Amino acid sequence: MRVVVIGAGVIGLSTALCIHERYHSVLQPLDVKVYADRFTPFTTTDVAAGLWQPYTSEPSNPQEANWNQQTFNYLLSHIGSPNAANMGLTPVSGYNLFREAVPDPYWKDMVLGFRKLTPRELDMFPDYRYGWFNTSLILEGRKYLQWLTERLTERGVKFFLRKVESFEEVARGGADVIINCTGVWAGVLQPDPLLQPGRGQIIKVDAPWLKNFIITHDLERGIYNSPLIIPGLQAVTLGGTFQVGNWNEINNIQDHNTIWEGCCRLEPTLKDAKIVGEYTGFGPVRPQVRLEREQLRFGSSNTEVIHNYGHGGYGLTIHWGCALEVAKLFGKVLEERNLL
Amino acid sequence: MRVVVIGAGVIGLSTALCIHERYHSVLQPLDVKVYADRFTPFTTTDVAAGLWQPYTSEPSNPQEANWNQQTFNYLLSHIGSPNAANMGLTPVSGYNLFREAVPDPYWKDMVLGFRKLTPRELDMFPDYRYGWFNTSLILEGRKYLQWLTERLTERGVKFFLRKVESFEEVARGGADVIINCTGVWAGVLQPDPLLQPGRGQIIKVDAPWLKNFIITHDLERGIYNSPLIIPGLQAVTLGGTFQVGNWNEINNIQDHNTIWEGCCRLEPTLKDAKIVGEYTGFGPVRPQVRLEREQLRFGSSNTEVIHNYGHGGYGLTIHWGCALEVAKLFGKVLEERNLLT
Numbered sequence: 122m123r124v125v126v127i128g129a130g131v132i133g134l135s136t137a138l139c140i141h142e143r144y145h146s147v148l149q150p151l152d153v154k155v156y157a158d159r160f161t162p163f164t165t166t167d168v169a170a171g172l173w174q175p176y177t178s179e180p181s182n183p184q185e186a187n188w189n190q191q192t193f194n195y196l197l198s199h200i201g202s203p204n205a206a207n208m209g210l211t212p213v214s215g216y217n218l219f220r221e222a223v224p225d226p227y228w229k230d231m232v233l234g235f236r237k238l239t240p241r242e243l244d245m246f247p248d249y250r251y252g253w254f255n256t257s258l259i260l261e262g263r264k265y266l267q268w269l270t271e272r273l274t275e276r277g278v279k280f281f282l283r284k285v286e287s288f289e290e291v292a293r294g295g296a297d298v299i300i301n302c303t304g305v306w307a308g309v310l311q312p313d314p315l316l317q318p319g320r321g322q323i324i325k326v327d328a329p330w331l332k333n334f335i336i337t338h339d340l341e342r343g344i345y346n347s348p349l350i351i352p353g354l355q356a357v358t359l360g361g362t363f364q365v366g367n368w369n370e371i372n373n374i375q376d377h378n379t380i381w382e383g384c385c386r387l388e389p390t391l392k393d394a395k396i397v398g399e400y401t402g403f404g405p406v407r408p409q410v411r412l413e414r415e416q417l418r419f420g421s422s423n424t425e426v427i428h429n430y431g432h433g434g435y436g437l438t439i440h441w442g443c444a445l446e447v448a449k450l451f452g453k454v455l456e457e458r459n460l461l
Numbered sequence: 462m463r464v465v466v467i468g469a470g471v472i473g474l475s476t477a478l479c480i481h482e483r484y485h486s487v488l489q490p491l492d493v494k495v496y497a498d499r500f501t502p503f504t505t506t507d508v509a510a511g512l513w514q515p516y517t518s519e520p521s522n523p524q525e526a527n528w529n530q531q532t533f534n535y536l537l538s539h540i541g542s543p544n545a546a547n548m549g550l551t552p553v554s555g556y557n558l559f560r561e562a563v564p565d566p567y568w569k570d571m572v573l574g575f576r577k578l579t580p581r582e583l584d585m586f587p588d589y590r591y592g593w594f595n596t597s598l599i600l601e602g603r604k605y606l607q608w609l610t611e612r613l614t615e616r617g618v619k620f621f622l623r624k625v626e627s628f629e630e631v632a633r634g635g636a637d638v639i640i641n642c643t644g645v646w647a648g649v650l651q652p653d654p655l656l657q658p659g660r661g662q663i664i665k666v667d668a669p670w671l672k673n674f675i676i677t678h679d680l681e682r683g684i685y686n687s688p689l690i691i692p693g694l695q696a697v698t699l700g701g702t703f704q705v706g707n708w709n710e711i712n713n714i715q716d717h718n719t720i721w722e723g724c725c726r727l728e729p730t731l732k733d734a735k736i737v738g739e740y741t742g743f744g745p746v747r748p749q750v751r752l753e754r755e756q757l758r759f760g761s762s763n764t765e766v767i768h769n770y771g772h773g774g775y776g777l778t779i780h781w782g783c784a785l786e787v788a789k790l791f792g793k794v795l796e797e798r799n800l801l802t
């Protein structure tokens with residue numbers, strides 16, 4: 122059984138680890154390899170704000186809510202462990218701010234200590250009238266990617282920096298199963314018109330006095346198109362743009378200003394914060410996560426492909442539940458081949 | 462009106478600023494000076510973990526509860542301001558942990574979002590089975606001392622290196638009023654056997670991933686004799702000793718160990734944290750804060766002294782209320798000389 126995972130972002134590596142941890146002990150031989158054209162720190166995952174929080178509306182697919190919950194429980198469970206921080210993981214509390222009353226989110230009971238903000242808390246944020254408090258987790262993309270690659274490597278999973286031109290090529294080269302974790306670029310290997318890029322730009326800043334996340338919403342502009350502040354492990358992420366359809370990989374002057382003055386008015390102490398870097402990444406926006414089997418016919422055999430892409434602006438939030446589901450589908454593939 | 466404040470720790474500079482802001486306008490010529498033999502970063506204040514939280518038990522002087530609350534509201538009112546962090550101030554959330562159920566603290570409604578901990582929160586901290594969550598404020602001693610000294614300076618308040626040897630000496634040199642903010646050493650200038658040193662040792666550590674304060678309690682060993690973790694503005698403070706009666710200024714090995722491994726057990730990610738410094742300071746422990754007027758006679762003239770010392774392990778938590786009370790007592794000194802507000 123030769124399995125090639127394509128993609129070395131959170132989705133690819135989490136899935137690779139999940140498959141391997143689950144089947145190494147019971148299937149000889151199992152050969153899992155990762156192929157990608159960019160590894161940390163050059164993936165969208167590396168640019169992620171680094172916080173666990175789903176969108177404010179339910180998902181179309183009710184499986185996604187579960188995947189989000191499994192991910193939180195998976196991540197929470199690590200708190201107490203000596204290596205939580207070396208995985209990119211720590212607990213944070215913070216605020217969600219609104220210009221008007223809004224319904225509770227479906228995830229209110231998944232986080233810790235969810236409640237509405239009292240009138241007294243609201244005076245800390247003059248521009249907003251209603252909000253939430255809760256405790257969630259930081260999950261730093263960059264650090265988590267380094268952790269997962271060390272955990273994969275020690276288990277004998279090999280990485281190959283290479284650009285896949287088609288599913289065909291990889292199958293022809295000896296893959297029995299392909300796990301497709303190519304993120305926003307999946308369309309290059311199989312056209313998918315529902316998949317769009319969600320261009321997000323961020324400013325990273327040294328401001329270690331900030332201990333809380335602060336996320337504002339503007340209902341008339343779409344999600345994450347409103348200032349947001351997320352303290353990371355060593356730096357702070359400043360955001361406020363997320364526009365679908367825009368394929369420009371370069372930083373832009375307007376979004377820089379939108380992020381900087383939006384965040385400087387939210388958190389005026391930002392005046393003394395040193396800019397550390399400024400980045401742009403593309404969320405794999407899709408009305409729903411594509412996570413499914415597909416049978417491909419080349420040469421003399423079927424090669425099974427399992428897709429796992431289209432996680433929009435919530436891939437870190439939802440990744441573990443998605444990896445588990447892919448390992449399930451793999452298991453079905455195995456019994457069909459009378460392998461276990 | 463020549464006022465000498467003795468002390469440049471949080472209590473001293475607080476009170477100085479507060480008097481000055483209240484009475485500069487209505488009283489020329491007001492001349493406020495600060496005398497001290499230790500300034501930042503060599504004051505007890507500089508060593509303070511930097512968190513707002515009173516003791517778990519209510520104080521013998523209930524006035525201290527209001528002084529804590531005035532302080533919190535005062536500090537809170539600055540959140541939203543561009544300069545909150547330059548003052549040493551930022552909000553933080555965190556946990557108070559107990560091995561058994563305990564009554565709610567009197568300060569539960571002064572903080573933000575106080576509630577009990579749920580079983581799931583308790584799974585983060587194995588050794589413990591009851592506790593609180595809340596939001597409070599960091600007030601870094603070292604930074605707040607610097608902020609206050611810039612504010613005082615630009616108001617024309619002048620600072621002098623001086624080890625005062627008696628109230629007499631200062632009254633002889635021309636002071637009409639003396640504000641005594643000498644912390645744990647007040648007994649040198651007037652014996653006060655209720656005042657004892659509360660030796661506290663800490664390890665400062667580079668661990669910027671830790672965003673929450675974590676304070677454990679051991680109902681039997683007395684307060685702050687249990688591991689505690691408090692993220693500061695740039696570094697993290699680790700503690701766990703608070704020993705009354707002990708005057709040894711040097712760091713010792715067995716308290717280092719008590720702290721380090723007590724805290725490594727609580728927060729095991731601390732294995733990767735670089736040690737940046739370890740320090741020892743003496744909290745001015747007293748059954749209650751001394752904050753009162755006293756008239757002393759030296760030759761022909763009366764000298765007015767207002768004492769403000771004995772703030773134990775809660776001086777930052779309570780300081781603004783105390784400064785405001787000293788300013789009230791100053792007002793009454795004024796009105797006794799038929800001067801007006």
Ligand SMILES: Cc1cc2nc3c(=O)[nH]c(=O)nc-3n(C[C@H](O)[C@H](O)[C@H](O)COP(=O)(O)OP(=O)(O)OC[C@H]3O[C@@H](n4cnc5c(N)ncnc54)[C@H](O)[C@@H]3O)c2cc1C
Pocket residue numbers: 127128129130131132133156157158159160164165166167168169170171172173174283284285286302303304305306307309310319320321322323401402403404405429430431432433434435436437438439
């Ligand atoms: C600014 C910003 C902030 C965000 N913040 C958060 C957050 O705080 N929390 C959260 O949960 N989510 C966040 N997201 C969303 C999250 O970043 C994404 O959902 C996630 O990173 C996507 O993971 P992925 O592994 O699917 O894609 P990627 O991380 O892009 O990985 C794609 C991989 O596929 C490889 N690849 C693709 N095509 C090929 C090919 N043809 N041949 C070889 N290799 C190929 C690439 O080299 C790369 O290794 C954010 C997104 C942005 C843009």
Ligand SMILES: Cc1cc2nc3c(=O)[nH]c(=O)nc-3n(C[C@H](O)[C@H](O)[C@H](O)COP(=O)(O)OP(=O)(O)OC[C@H]3O[C@@H](n4cnc5c(N)ncnc54)[C@H](O)[C@@H]3O)c2cc1C
Pocket residue numbers: 467468469470471472473496497498499500504505506507508509510511512513514623624625626642643644645646647649650659660661662663700741742743744745770771772773774775776777778779
């Ligand atoms: C390890 C530790 C951690 C702590 N953490 C916290 C915390 O998180 N929150 C909190 O609220 N409290 C905390 N405390 C308590 C807090 O540090 C004190 O309550 C506070 O610093 C007392 O301030 P002060 O100005 O009264 O005294 P100090 O800061 O000691 O200042 C005293 C001043 O008096 C001067 N002085 C004294 N005698 C003379 C003299 N004869 N002539 C001239 N000058 C003189 C000194 O030079 C100095 O300027 C902590 C204490 C310790 C030991």
Ligand SMILES: C[C@@H](N)CCc1ccccc1
Pocket residue numbers: 170171172173174175321322345349360361362363404434435438
């Ligand atoms: C709060 C996070 N779950 C999303 C943050 C984000 C996503 C896309 C662009 C900027 C920020």
Ligand SMILES: C[C@@H](N)CCc1ccccc1
Pocket residue numbers: 510511512513514515661662676685689700701702703744774775
């Ligand atoms: C939460 C703060 N009030 C810490 C106080 C303190 C006092 C003495 C020793 C260590 C810490």
